[PDB]
Design an enzyme around this catalytic site. Structure first.
Site, PDB file in Angstrom:
ATOM      1  N   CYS A  43      -9.469 -70.865 -40.081  1.00  0.00           N
ATOM      2  CA  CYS A  43      -8.698 -71.607 -39.127  1.00  0.00           C
ATOM      3  C   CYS A  43      -7.656 -70.834 -38.193  1.00  0.00           C
ATOM      4  O   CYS A  43      -7.183 -71.319 -37.307  1.00  0.00           O
ATOM      5  CB  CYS A  43      -7.907 -72.497 -40.172  1.00  0.00           C
ATOM      6  SG  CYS A  43      -6.242 -71.953 -40.825  1.00  0.00           S
ATOM      7  N   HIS A 100      -5.738 -73.658 -46.322  1.00  0.00           N
ATOM      8  CA  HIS A 100      -4.519 -73.954 -45.212  1.00  0.00           C
ATOM      9  C   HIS A 100      -4.223 -75.289 -44.903  1.00  0.00           C
ATOM     10  O   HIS A 100      -5.556 -75.862 -44.279  1.00  0.00           O
ATOM     11  CB  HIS A 100      -4.591 -72.787 -44.236  1.00  0.00           C
ATOM     12  CG  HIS A 100      -4.747 -71.452 -44.502  1.00  0.00           C
ATOM     13  ND1 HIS A 100      -6.004 -70.749 -44.513  1.00  0.00           N
ATOM     14  CD2 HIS A 100      -3.870 -70.668 -45.264  1.00  0.00           C
ATOM     15  CE1 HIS A 100      -5.765 -69.597 -45.075  1.00  0.00           C
ATOM     16  NE2 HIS A 100      -4.622 -69.478 -45.451  1.00  0.00           N
ATOM     17  N   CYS A 144       1.049-102.390   0.053  1.00  0.00           N
ATOM     18  CA  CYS A 144      -0.467-102.130   0.049  1.00  0.00           C
ATOM     19  C   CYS A 144      -0.985-102.275  -1.582  1.00  0.00           C
ATOM     20  O   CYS A 144      -1.357-103.431  -1.698  1.00  0.00           O
ATOM     21  CB  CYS A 144      -0.654-100.730   0.540  1.00  0.00           C
ATOM     22  SG  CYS A 144       0.576 -99.566   0.798  1.00  0.00           S
TER      23      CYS A 144
HETATM   24 ZN   LIG Z   1      -6.949 -71.126 -42.892  1.00  0.00          ZN
END
Ligand SMILES: [Zn+2]
Ligand SMILES: C[S@@+](CC[C@H](N)C(=O)[O-])C[C@H]1O[C@@H](n2cnc3c(N)ncnc32)[C@H](O)[C@@H]1O
Ligand SMILES: [Zn+2]
Ligand SMILES: [Zn+2]
Ligand SMILES: [Zn+2]
Length: 1135
Positions: free
Chosen positions: A6, A58, A756
């Protein structure tokens, strides 16, 4: 140390490891539980106490794009029954290491708060409930992100056409619930989450697919996209007004449909790499460029060549012989009738075949018939102009012809056949009418695009044989254009001394004062050290024609001239003049121009000689003391009125008293103001003394209230114009609220500035775009004009109204007016030129009923920067222009931000008190005029937005020097005062195009500086120097004006409606104060009297002001209408 899976840093104090519950079992076994059992095939379950993690353990985000970066993310928590709404672990099984997340998705952008977050695994779909205690913070951020995206999506669903400043306000004003762990959202948040928020907005468009414009193509959306460096195409989640018209106006727009109504992919993006049930692979980058380019127009073209010049083919050789007795002699023998096999006489219309190429067919009126000295049989052809060939083009009736100023002599040989041409004359009761072969209704001036009523006429017995309107026109104009001598006194050498002369209809006597270009005469005339780039990293971006002088004024002393042959040479008329000094022309220069009257001059005993050609116009210079009314009264009592009280000695540089030779009803139209707003246009009109607005239609409550407050005797209908007309048409007498609706005859003048948004595009029309315009407010507005039939009509718009839809909007607008029988024209004007410190152009359409006079466009009064003064219009490869001749110069000096607001007392950021003393007298001429003669205690609306502690810190740090902006901000830590600390900007990348600093420091704020892709979380927020500015600066001219202060000698970039420092409305910070411009300052920038009342909250007032037509421009137009009334008033009274 970081994660191979990660990438999270092990030293990161925010890292957390996965903690499992005892009950933990793998996915396939969990998806077997009895506890478990909407149109899908997977199945679907609820999920609580969830936690997402990398293969190593993690805890991880899901927004970060790791799933895409091929990183396997796993999750754990308590699964539940699809219907079980309990977010407590009490009804389901605990699962562990649940299958690598295939994808994550969202649902809930419409009629619901159903903002559901879901996971897709190789086994089943999971609707996430509450996260685990450890996962809560990570899911927290993800939630903040999703919530902003919802707000943005919902706001844009009800408000496409929303501008950047509307978005920022919607966000900043939205209160997040307790559940979302943030106090309030800011532009900082949106910018921080610009990538997510944008991609979710793109995703909503893929998913909820209609035929409508995608929500990411919104004006605010593209503003965000350009501001924050955002990559489009990053794919993700999934799961009719009818204009009140008159038949005449319906048919006009209905025929154009049944008649004239009939790929540069990026390659790189994820949509450009997406094949192929699915039809939409539409590149989002192309989409933006196209939407952006649709907003810009093609604003130096040569004069459009006249028609019928032009080659024609000869015809018959059978029998052409005169019939009857001659009408008169001249070397030419005129005759009334003529045989050409069949009869032909003066007033009959003929057709002439040109050289068989681009062959439409020429048509003319037989003005005269004669036989010259060479026995040649002749005719005078006064040419018609077709339906096309006019500005109208395709829009016109294939049978409608126009009278032009084109006539020539021709042989009877060139005549093909006699054609039938009818004058579609207005009825006895034309004003009450609202609800085959050739015909003509109006006169066409090619150069100015003026459709006007024919002269009607008249042929005298003296010229009954010659009668050509096109010849008479050229005569009058040659006659008015020529410099002629009225009276002469006693000739000297070759000079003939005169008492009076003339040109352009203006009569110049002796002692009369005159306008001249700045070149016409003359008066008695009179590096940079290194920056600390550590402190100022962005200053390097700082690197890398102004208004003419007002006219030279002189009093006429001697009209001497010259001579040729035996009689007076008109080609040479000269003038000896006593020069006048404007205060700025003096040793006072710039300090003169300040507190001084715009209108004041100085007498000079100086002398100059100029030709009568150079003379621009006539003015009135009076001596202050020999005046019977006040200087104010004299000055605000007519045009070109100047004055002097003292005389200037250029030599001694002194102010002596001047010498003794230097010494000496209107009908108010009953106006209906549709789309009335807070009443700017009505105000200038009221100011011109030519009107009285008795009815006003305003759909928006605050504006309508502000109108009432300023126009007490006005029926203000706080309604949608479409519903209001329908009632009148239905036969109704009053509205629901018992307010008397105007009926036919009540309205003398119908004026309006429709917004407009609807039409608002440059590219060619199509079934989709046409249908919107077919029911636009322009179409509703033309019906009001049709039904009501006012003596006068004004349509106001953004300058580009004139360029929208390949000029089709303007062409159909004019077409409609013409069908109805109206004399009409268009033109562009610059507010700045009418005495307002603002650069703003408006398209103006003028129309006047037959009987009345079509007004000219006002001549500029103030000198303005040429760049801001491009008033020309190209329609179908033809450059159209208005009667405006003052290209160029003008009688008065420019109005500046200083003239506009130098008197107002100091206020701070977030100044909230609506009624405050001035605590000082006016300083400028303009301030004197807007404040009034009568003393007023209360200063109203000197109120300014409370900008966030971050923005405030930035404004305090922008220097005071002219032209200072964001690039001047220091890279310093600032204590915001809420615990929050505005951080230093981090430069960690190499800007390959910009190089290194003087110190050798990097100039790179993102990886894209190096040519690599943008690295997120390399993105910084809450910095004093906004991160987004260096980030996208190079591809956007360094964001020049952003966080920039208005200049005292400058002007407002545009009509400000919501002051935002990184907004799309130009320099918005006060020249000296650490704030954005106050409402009243914008009101001043608009030239509103200080008595003018506004209604609602700060922003409603800001909107009111910025939407408004500036009264000085409204008065300028109103004063042209003055002439038309006065002129038609006298031309009525006769024998
Ligand atoms: Zn990790
Ligand atoms: C740009 S303003 C025109 C400014 C105005 N002429 C002045 O000088 O103050 C456009 C206004 O039209 C109003 N409006 C929009 N749609 C409308 C409708 N269908 N009927 C009536 N008014 C409308 C808006 O609320 C807005 O005030
Ligand atoms: Zn693409
Ligand atoms: Zn003629
Ligand atoms: Zn970048």
């Amino acid at each position: 140390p970081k994660c191979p899976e990660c990438g999270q840093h092990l030293d990161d104090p925010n890292l957390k490891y996965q903690q499992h519950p005892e009950d933990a079992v793998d996915e396939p076994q969990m998806l077997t539980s009895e506890k478990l059992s909407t149109y899908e095939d997977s199945p679907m379950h609820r999920f609580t106490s969830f936690s997402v993690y990398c293969s190593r353990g993690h805890l991880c985000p899901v927004d970060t794009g790791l799933i895409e970066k091929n990183v396997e993310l796993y999750f754990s928590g308590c699964a539940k029954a699809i219907h079980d709404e309990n977010p407590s672990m009490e009804g389901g099984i605990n699962g562990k290491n649940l299958g690598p997340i295939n994808q994550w998705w969202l649902s809930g952008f419409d009629g619901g708060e159903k903002v559901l977050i879901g996971f897709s695994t190789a086994f089943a779909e999971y609707i996430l409930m509450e996260p685990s205690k450890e996962y809560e913070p990570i899911f927290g951020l993800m939630q903040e992100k999703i919530y902003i995206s919802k707000i943005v999506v919902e706001f844009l669903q009800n408000n496409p056409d929303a501008v950047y400043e509307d978005l920022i306000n919607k966000i900043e004003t939205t209160v997040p619930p307790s559940t979302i762990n943030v106090n309030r959202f800011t532009e900082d948040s949106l910018l921080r989450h610009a990538q997510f928020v944008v991609s979710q907005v793109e995703s909503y468009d893929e998913a909820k697919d209609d035929d409508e414009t995608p929500i990411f193509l919104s004006p605010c959306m593209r503003a965000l996209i350009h501001l924050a460096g955002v990559s489009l195409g990053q794919r993700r989640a999934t799961r009719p007004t009818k204009a009140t018209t008159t038949k005449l106006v319906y048919q006009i727009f209905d025929t154009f449909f049944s008649e004239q109504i009939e790929r540069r992919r990026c390659g790189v993006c994820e949509v450009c790499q997406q094949p192929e049930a699915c039809l939409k692979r539409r590149c989002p980058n192309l989409a933006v460029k196209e939407a952006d380019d649709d907003e810009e127009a093609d604003d130096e073209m040569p004069s459009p060549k006249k028609l019928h010049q032009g080659k024609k083919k000869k015809q018959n050789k059978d029998r052409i012989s005169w019939l009857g007795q001659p009408m008169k002699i001249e070397r030419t023998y005129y005759q009334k009738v003529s045989i050409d096999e069949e009869m032909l006489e003066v007033g009959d219309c003929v057709s002439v075949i040109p050289d068989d190429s681009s062959k439409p067919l020429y048509l003319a009126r037989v003005t005269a018939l004669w036989e010259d000295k060479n026995g040649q049989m002749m005719f005078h052809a006064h040419w018609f102009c077709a339906g096309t060939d006019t500005v109208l083009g395709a829009t016109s009736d294939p049978l409608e012809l126009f009278l032009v100023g084109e006539c020539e002599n021709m042989q009877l040989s060139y005549i093909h056949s006699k054609v039938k041409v009818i004058y579609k004359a207005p009825s006895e009761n034309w004003a009450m009418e609202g609800g085959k072969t050739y015909f003509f209704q109006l006169w066409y001036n090619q150069e100015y695009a003026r459709f006007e009523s024919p002269p009607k006429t008249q042929p005298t017995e003296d010229n009954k044989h010659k009668f050509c309107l096109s010849c008479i026109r050229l005569a009058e104009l040659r006659q008015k254009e020529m410099p002629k001598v009225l009276e002469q006194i006693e000739e000297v050498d070759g000079r003939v001394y005169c008492s009076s002369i003339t040109k352009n209809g203006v009569v110049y006597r002796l002692g009369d004062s005159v306008y001249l270009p700045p070149e016409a005469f003359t008066f008695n005339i009179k590096k940079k050290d290194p920056v600390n780039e550590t402190l100022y990293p962005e200053h390097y971006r700082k690197y890398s024609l102004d208004a003419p002088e007002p006219y030279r004024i002189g009093r006429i002393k001697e009209i001497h001239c010259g001579k040729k042959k035996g009689k007076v040479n008109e080609a040479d008329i000269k003038l000896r003049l006593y020069k006048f000094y404007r205060p700025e022309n003096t040793h006072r220069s710039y300090n003169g121009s300040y507190h001084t009257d715009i209108n004041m001059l100085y007498w000079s005993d100086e002398e100059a000689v100029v030709n009568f050609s150079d003379v621009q116009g006539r003015c009135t210079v009076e001596y202050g003391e020999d005046l019977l009314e006040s200087i104010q009264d004299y000055s605000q009592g007519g045009p070109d009125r100047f004055y002097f009280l003292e005389a200037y000695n250029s030599k001694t540089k002194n102010f002596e008293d001047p010498p003794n030779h230097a010494r000496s009803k209107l009908p108010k139209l009953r106006t209906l103001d549709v789309f009335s707003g807070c009443g700017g246009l009505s105000e200038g009109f009221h100011q011109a003394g030519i009107s009285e607005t008795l009815w006003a239609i305003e759909m928006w409550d605050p504006a309508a209230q502000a109108f009432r407050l300023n126009n007490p005797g006005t029926t203000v209908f706080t309604e949608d114009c479409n519903v209001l007309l329908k009632l009148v048409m239905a036969g109704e007498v009053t509205n629901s609220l018992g307010q008397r609706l105007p009926q036919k005859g009540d309205v003398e003048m119908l004026c309006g500035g429709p917004p407009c948004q609807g039409f608002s595009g440059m590219n060619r029309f199509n079934s989709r775009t046409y249908s919107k315009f077919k029911n636009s407010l322009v179409v509703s507005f033309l019906s009001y004009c049709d039904y009501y039939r006012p003596r006068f009509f004004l349509l106001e718009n953004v300058r580009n109204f004139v360029s929208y839809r390949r000029s089709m909007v303007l062409k159909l607008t004019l077409r409609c007016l013409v069908r109805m029988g109206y004399q009409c024209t268009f033109g562009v004007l610059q507010a700045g030129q009418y005495g307002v410190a603002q650069t703003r152009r408006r398209a103006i359409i003028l129309a006047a009923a037959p009987g009345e006079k079509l007004p000219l466009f006002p001549e500029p009064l103030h000198v303005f920067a040429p760049r801001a003064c491009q008033l020309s219009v190209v329609v179908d490869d033809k450059k159209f222009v208005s009667n405006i001749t003052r290209l160029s110069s003008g009688p008065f000096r420019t109005i500046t931000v200083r003239d506009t607001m130098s008197d107002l007392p100091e206020i701070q950021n977030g100044a909230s008190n609506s009624e405050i003393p001035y605590n000082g007298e006016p300083l400028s001429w303009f301030q004197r005029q807007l404040r009034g003669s009568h003393y007023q205690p209360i200063l109203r609306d000197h109120i300014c937005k409370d900008m966030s502690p971050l923005v405030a810190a930035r404004m305090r740090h922008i220097p005071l020097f002219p032209g200072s902006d964001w690039r001047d901000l220091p890279n310093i830590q600032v204590r915001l005062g809420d615990g929050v600390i505005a951080h230093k900007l981090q430069y960690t990348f190499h800007d390959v195009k910009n190089g290194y600093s003087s110190t050798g420091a990097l100039r790179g704020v993102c990886s894209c500086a190096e040519g690599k892709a943008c690295d997120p979380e390399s993105r910084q927020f809450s910095t004093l120097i906004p991160w987004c500015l260096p980030h996208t600066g190079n591809r956007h001219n360094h964001w020049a004006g952003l966080y920039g202060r208005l200049e005292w000698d400058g002007f407002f970039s545009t009509t400000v409606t919501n002051p935002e420092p990184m907004g799309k409305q130009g320099r918005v910070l006060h020249p000296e104060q650490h704030r954005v411009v106050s409402v009243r300052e914008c009101a001043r920038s608009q030239g509103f009297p200080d008595s003018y009342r506004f209604f609602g909250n700060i922003l409603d007032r800001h909107r009111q002001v910025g939407n408004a037509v500036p009264p000085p421009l409204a008065k300028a137009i109103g004063l042209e209408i003055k002439l038309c009334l006065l002129s038609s008033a006298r031309e009525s009274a006769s024998a």
